[PDB]
Amino acid sequence: KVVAGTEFPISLGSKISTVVKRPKQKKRSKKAKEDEEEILVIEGIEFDRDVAVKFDVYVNDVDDLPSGPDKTEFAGSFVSVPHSHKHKKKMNTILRLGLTDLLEEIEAEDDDSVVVTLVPKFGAVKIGGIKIEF
Ligand SMILES: [Ca+2]
Ligand SMILES: [Cl-]
């Protein structure tokens, strides 16, 4: 299912994808800040600590056909091992993934946005938001 950016926060009960804008400086010049890593930030990841959580993150070129064959590229994963905490039932955390090499490999360096796919593997988890920044 394709989800708008304003649909977050969301419960990640199934695989979803969303269009994420690259940083604003890239709109003017696609090689702006070329010696800095371009970082995908998944914010507000929230779940019960006693629930094992895993989801995988993929990226694809925004111009690919969603009704066409999968051209998604693995970017990273979020994992939590079940545990208890002396004063918290839940964890609220973040995942940051480097995109610079990935965008070159998928040949999306000229694009202003990308598609991010989140693939739940186990555990109930909320995703607060997604952005790309330096
Ligand atoms: Ca493209
Ligand atoms: Cl926390």
Numbering used by the authors: 369 to 502
Task: Copy out sentences from the published article reporting this entry, exactly as the authors wrote them.
To corroborate this result, an orthogonal experiment was performed, where the sole C‐terminal domain was recombinantly overexpressed (Csole‐domain) and crystallized. In summary, we have recombinantly produced and successfully crystallized the pro‐form of MdPPO1 and two versions of its C‐terminal domain, one obtained after self‐cleavage (Ccleaved) and the other one as an independently expressed domain (Csole). Structural analysis of the separated C‐terminal domains, Ccleaved and Csole, revealed a metal‐binding site. The bound metal was identified as Ca2+ based on the composition of the used expression media and buffers, the interacting amino acids, the binding geometry, and the presence of anomalous signal. This binding site is absent in the C‐terminal domain still attached to the pro‐enzyme. Moreover, pro‐MdPPO1 was incubated with different amounts of Csole‐domain to investigate whether the C‐terminal domain plays a role in the self‐cleavage process. The results clearly demonstrate that the addition of (external) Csole‐terminal domain significantly increases the self‐cleavage rate as with increasing concentration of external Csole‐domain, the pro‐enzyme is cleaved into its active and C‐terminal domain faster.
